[PDB]
């Protein structure tokens, strides 16, 4: 049996006997992490004997 009116947007659904609820609890979580690292090190010498 069943045949209670269940809608999502304009689309109407027939729920299974087994299912208590199927309901559009919409949600969204985005997550962005960017980590850039640089190191440089320079070493020189110049040395002369005459």
């Amino acid at each position: 049996g069943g045949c209670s009116p269940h809608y999502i947007l304009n689309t109407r659904f027939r729920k299974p006997y087994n299912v208590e609820s199927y309901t559009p609890q919409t949600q969204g979580k985005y997550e962005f992490i960017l980590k850039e690292y640089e190191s440089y090190s320079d070493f020189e010498r110049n040395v002369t004997e005459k």
């Binding site: 009116p5 809608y7 559009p24």
Partner: protein
């Protein structure tokens, strides 16, 4: 409520078994509930939110 053409038994709709469409009245023009009213039915866990 029997043979309203509305399923007034919640899950079973037993008030609408073997019910003649000649006896079913046009109980209402429409049956679309407000667009997410079922969520108002839900319970809430006040600790976990």
């Amino acid at each position: 409520l029997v043979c309203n053409g509305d399923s007034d038994c919640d899950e079973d709709s037993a008030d609408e078994d073997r019910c003649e469409d000649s006896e079913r009245r046009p109980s209402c023009d429409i049956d679309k509930p407000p667009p997410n009213i079922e969520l108002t039915g839900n319970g809430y866990n006040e600790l976990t939110g």
